[PDB]
């Protein structure tokens with residue numbers, strides 16, 4: 001069938017029009033290997049989305065696929081017992097690999113992993129409130145926590161990556177805080193920002209939890225945590241089993257050991273093949289030179305993309321880690337037009353602006369993507385000269401601050417509005433009706 | 446290479462929940478399995494009656510499922526940059542043909558996420574706040590609290606304990622605020638007509654009726670309770686759908702499923718392809734003439750044999766329910782567990798909660814092996830435990846059956862003063878609440 005035939009069938013039976021069809025490039029992938037994907041009509045594309053970050057090593061990685069198919073064929077997938085040899089071997093590998101990991105438990109998705117981390121922190125501490133920055137998943141309490149402010153029905157206070165807010169909240173009501181959970185943003189902030197958050201949480205005996213579902217294999221081979229940010233819990237997900245569904249919650253023994261009293265559970269958390277896959281992923285990441293070559297390819301792409309935009313006179317900022325770099329533009333229309341056009345030249349850029357190379361990339365794959373980006377940017381500007389400034393200027397500080405707030409809820413200004421919002425939120429928490437709490441297990445109430 | 450004692454010690458150090466993973470289950474760990482049989486770390490063999498905690502419907506390492514999943518992984522790929530794939534569309538088309546309620550179908554990784562999705566879509570499609578619930582839907586706090594009769598304002602969930610008198614009164618009192626009714630069908634204490642009456646009440650108040658068939662979907666019948674003839678606006682499937690590979694599905698009325706865009710639901714691994722290939726293979730097996738009928742015959746053989754073993758020892762008992770999910774109810778909550786722990790020694794994993802789950806891979810030899818183990822274990826426990834093993838015959842008391850239903854699944858089956866006052870108290874709590882205080886919803890309703 002071709003694209004048009006498949007989407008007509010999909011519209012009738014399964015597809016969400018925007019999420020599945022009109023918000024995405026007009027192709028459907030049939031197979032993929034290494035850096036390259038092939039659509040239903042045989043057209044080939046370099047992938048820069050990492051399969052929405054699920055893939056770190058490349059498509060159909062041979063050692064990962066050998067390990068997963070061996071488990072499926074020779075032993076089985078999901079057994080009557082919850083422990084298995086691969087689960088224990090993987091847990092041992094992770095506890096040896098990561099400083100925070102004294103025990104580790106597994107789930108299917110990052111959304112459920114961060115929910116489990118919050119559930120365990122509440123059960124281990126007996127406290128009600130959670131302070132949050134960043135995206136943690138699609139449940140309502142997670143999405144609301146991306147916005148600055150307090151939701152009494154969920155027990156979550158969003159703090160917008162704001163250090164002044166975090167310190168003021170912990171001083172005001174830190175005895176009520178079960179945990180601080182943060183998806184580290186490392187374009188606008190350096191590692192010291194997160195070291196200060198962590199040390200500040202420790203001063204108040206509040207667990208600090210890094211949501212590394214996205215950054216865990218892309219800020220570095222051991223994530224932001226492994227770059228030297230102490231934490232009591234780290235959640236991993238994207239990349240862990242190189243596209244197979246697996247998430248992990250690793251951390252302090254007493255937090256993980258709250259599993260029994262928490263009531264957490266789940267039929268498929270014992271599923272064995274993804275655990276075999278993750279063991280193979282760690283073996284690749286720990287092979288001398290492999291991660292460094294991936295970062296070299298990321299730098300080659302980032303440097304070339306920055307050069308292309310600057311040569312067109314387009315204000316831009318290209319930054320962040322090599323395996324998860326952002327391309328920040330003067331407005332939210334230019335990027336989408338370029339990336340849509342680059343699909344015509346054989347590339348799937350990440351249209352949210354964070355480009356994701358994988359370990360299978362070579363210089364030829366990077367340079368194919370750069371050719372498409374140069375040609376697409378040229379065509380877009382030729383056809384729509386007013387789509388963005390072309391005067392050679394820099395991104396304004398106003399655009400950078402506005403982008404941070406719109407993209408990830410970061411409140412980076414020290415102005416009247418931000419200061420008033422901090423005070424309003426702290427007052428709302430401190431003087432609330434304490435008889436009204438979220439539904440919690442165990443109950444606190 | 447490592448035995449049970451070594452594995453549990455290594456696990457306690459790095460991963461195990463002491464009760465959930467170790468002390469609360471049989472003292473063996475499964476290394477590999479095929480069909481109805483599992484083998485532990487030391488080579489001992491067991492017939493599985495847990496269905497891998499219901500994940501498995503056909504049997505372990507079923508050749509058609511193994512072929513479909515490995516072919517997709519090996520020859521094409523696992524998760525791609527596009528969310529649509531050929532197997533997703535083919536699976537959606539198969540399910541839309543198979544099920545009356547399925548106009549569209551979306552997929553997720555776990556049944557807990559599937560039922561959460563169903564509620565999110567019902568609220569998004571209707572613009573209404575409250576959900577009425579009966580039965581277990583997953584491990585999130587709002588799901589767990591909804592198993593108890595009553596109202597939690599912070600979640601917007603009212604548990605109604607399977608009670609039709611409560612359901613009708615709630616819909617009359619505040620049905621204009623109800624986005625959906627979500628029920629896990631219990632078919633030991635209730636018949637299909639009970640669920641048809643729930644569905645009819647929901648239809649009269651324009652409230653979506655949603656069947657959580659994460660457990661019952663392939664075990665109440667080959668098309669679940671819905672396929673036996675209970676109308677629904679949404680059905681959630683999960684256990685068995687991909688024969689042990691993680692996959693869940695939310696299928697239902699077009700306008701409810703089409704709330705996906707505005708709801709904010711996402712989740713990356715929802716596009717993962719191999720489990721969808723596996724589910725296509727599962728439907729093909731279930732639709733093969735004789736396969737499901739043979740599985741039900743094996744379940745009847747097991748249930749009939751377990752009933753006569755207990756009755757032969759004079760233990761009052763009730764063995765009933767569908768052949769692929771029958772309950773063994775005893776006079777107290779200790780006796781079954783003690784028999785099942787003892788039966789492990791004789792080469793069976795019985796389901797400790799009492800709902801025994803055969804799979805399509807069962808044959809008479811597997812059933813009879815389990816019955817022989819059950820007969821020996823029952824004899825041993827009866828002899829050793831007169832404190833929990835009455836041998837004086839008779840039936841379960843009416844009080845025991847009523848208490849078991851409330852404890853096991855939150856069913857409020859009594860028509861008495863305490864139950865009626867609880868119904869009225871809960872309705873007054875909902876109706877008289879501070880309407881300015883409500884759960885966080887997306888899309889927002891405040």
Ligand SMILES: *[C@H](NC[C@@H]1CC[C@@H](N)[C@@H](O[C@H]2[C@H](O)[C@@H](O[C@H]3OC[C@](C)(O)[C@H](NC)[C@H]3O)[C@H](N)C[C@@H]2N)O1)c1c(COP(=O)(O)O)cnc(C)c1O
Pocket residue numbers: 265266267268498499554555556557558560580581582583584629630631632633657658659660661683684770772800853854
């Ligand atoms: C699947 N959720 C898994 C949990 C844990 C263990 C599993 N065996 C299952 O057990 C539930 C029992 O099934 C249930 O018993 C009641 O329902 C079945 C039956 C035969 O009708 C019984 N008759 C007396 C009745 O008591 C217990 N009340 C509750 C137990 N937890 O549930 C699941 C999900 C989550 O899927 P996932 O995230 O993939 O694990 C969501 N919804 C449902 C309906 C189920 O079963």
Ligand SMILES: CN[C@@H]1[C@@H](O)[C@@H](O[C@@H]2[C@@H](O)[C@H](O[C@H]3O[C@@H](CNCc4c(COP(=O)(O)O)cnc(C)c4O)CC[C@H]3N)[C@@H](N)C[C@H]2N)OC[C@]1(C)O
Pocket residue numbers: 052053108109110111112114134135136137138183184185186187211212213214215237324326352354407408711712713714
């Ligand atoms: C400017 N710098 C940016 C910065 O703006 C910021 O951008 C993020 C995006 O990254 C994020 O989504 C990106 O990842 C996916 C979804 N989340 C998985 C996920 C899950 C649940 O896991 P599961 O249930 O298995 O899906 C849990 N926790 C985390 C941390 C997860 O990432 C798919 C879509 C893809 N675009 C957006 N959803 C929001 C947007 N604010 O963060 C990255 C950055 C580079 O720092």
Ligand SMILES: [Cl-]
Pocket residue numbers: 002003026027028029039040041
């Ligand atoms: Cl295509």
Ligand SMILES: [Cl-]
Pocket residue numbers: 075076077078504505506507689
């Ligand atoms: Cl299997």
Ligand SMILES: [Cl-]
Pocket residue numbers: 146147148158159160408409410411
């Ligand atoms: Cl914010």
Ligand SMILES: [Cl-]
Pocket residue numbers: 448449472473474475485486487
């Ligand atoms: Cl063992």
